[PDB]
Amino acid sequence: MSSKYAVKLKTDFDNPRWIKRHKHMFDFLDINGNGKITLDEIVSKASDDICAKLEATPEQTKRFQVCVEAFFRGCGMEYGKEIAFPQFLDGWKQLATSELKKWARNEPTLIREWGDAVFDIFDKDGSGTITLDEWKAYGKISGISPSQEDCEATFRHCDLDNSGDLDVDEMTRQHLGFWYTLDPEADGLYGNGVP
Ligand SMILES: O=C1N2C=C(c3ccc(O)cc3)N=C(Cc3ccccc3)C2=N[C@@]1(Cc1ccc(O)cc1)OO
Ligand code: NA
């Protein structure tokens, strides 16, 4: 049926591959290996660590911190509260549901704004475009994708602009499928760095 001006979107929140994916990332954020994380740690990872090592400007650093802050609050996190993976994953279920609704209605999403924040640190033209070399640097500083081979797979996997560079809107589409819905078209986005 035509759904009568609705669109049917698939989620896969009970698929073990989606659980493993976010479990992989939880462990990566759980640096002290105690099975708990805090919004405080995350925002400090964003500004005190990533943005400092990239040498983002103060305003660029604040925009990134605010987007990181708003994104993981979307998962039910709050500064001063430790959180464990099972409530982390349920937060992601809610975040993904609300984000997909806004995407379908052409409204701003937290994932897009986070992308805009990362790209603008690298892109001198302010057009949301980055190069393989810039992504490799982010992959190494954030730690999500330190392998150059994994980063090349990212550009191999995405559709690039006519000069071989990566647009923020392509990466946002990829991220919706990779983190929210387990779209098979997004498998391989980080090479072998992220399952
Ligand atoms: O998507 C991204 N990430 C997702 C998760 C993450 C964390 C936990 C999960 O359960 C799942 C995913 N963690 C980090 C790394 C990070 C985390 C916190 C603070 C700073 C950096 C991270 N960096 C991003 C930034 C990004 C965003 C949009 C773009 O268009 C391009 C790049 O690029 O991949
Ligand atoms: Na921890």
Number of structural domains (the chain) is 1
Residues 176/100, Cβ–Cβ less than 8 Å = yes
**Pocket flag, ligand 1, residue 37 (CB < 6 Å):** no
The whole-angstrom separation of Cα 102 and Cα 121 is 25
Q: Compute the Cα dihedral for 173, 176, 182, 187 and give only its sign.
A: positive
Rounded to the nearest angstrom, the distance between the alpha carbon of 133 and the centre of ligand 2 is: 31
Identify the residue whose tokens are 């033209």.
125
Active site residue 180: no
Which method, experimentally, gave rise to this model? X-ray
**Pocket flag, ligand 1, residue 166 (CB < 6 Å):** no
Domain encompassing residue 94 = 1-195
The whole-angstrom separation of Cα 154 and Cα 188 is 7
Q: In 3-state terms, what secondary structure has residue 54?
A: helix
**Pocket flag, ligand 1, residue 175 (CB < 6 Å):** yes
Task: Work out the angle at residue 56's Cα, subtended by the Cα atoms of residues 25 and 41, and round it to the nearest 5 degrees.
Answer: 35
What is the helix, strand, coil percentage profile of the chain, to 5? 60, 5, 35
Instruction: Round the CA-based radius of gyration of the chain to a whole number and report it.
Output: 17
Q: In the beta sheet, which residues pair with residue 84? A: 36
Q: Which long-range contacts (CB under 8 A, 24 or more apart) does 186-189 make?
A: 188/153, 188/157, 189/154, 189/157, 189/158
Rounded to the nearest angstrom, the distance between the alpha carbon of 119 and the centre of ligand 1 is: 12
The whole-angstrom separation of Cα 59 and Cα 35 is 33
Active site residue 190: yes
**Pocket flag, ligand 1, residue 22 (CB < 6 Å):** yes
39 HSE (CA, 13 A, CB side): 18
Rounded to the nearest angstrom, the distance between the alpha carbon of 30 and the centre of ligand 2 is: 4
Alpha-carbon distances of 53 from 21, 47, 56, 141, 154, rounded to whole Å = 26, 9, 8, 7, 22
Residues 78/39, Cβ–Cβ less than 8 Å = yes
Per the residue annotation, which of 114, 135, 138, 180 is the catalytic one? 138
182 HSE (CA, 13 A, CB side): 16
140 annotated to a ligand binding site: no
This structure's resolution (Å) is 2.2
144 HSE (CA, 13 A, CB side): 20
The whole-angstrom separation of Cα 36 and Cα 143 is 19
Strands (E), the chain: 36-38, 82-84, 129-130, 166-167
What is the per-residue burial (b if ≥16 Cβ within 10 Å, else e) of 148-164?
eebbebbbebbeeeeee
Alpha-carbon distances of 56 from 72, 123, 130, 193, rounded to whole Å = 21, 11, 15, 25
What's the DSSP call for residue 37?
Answer: E
Which ligand neighbours the alpha carbon of 36 most closely? 2
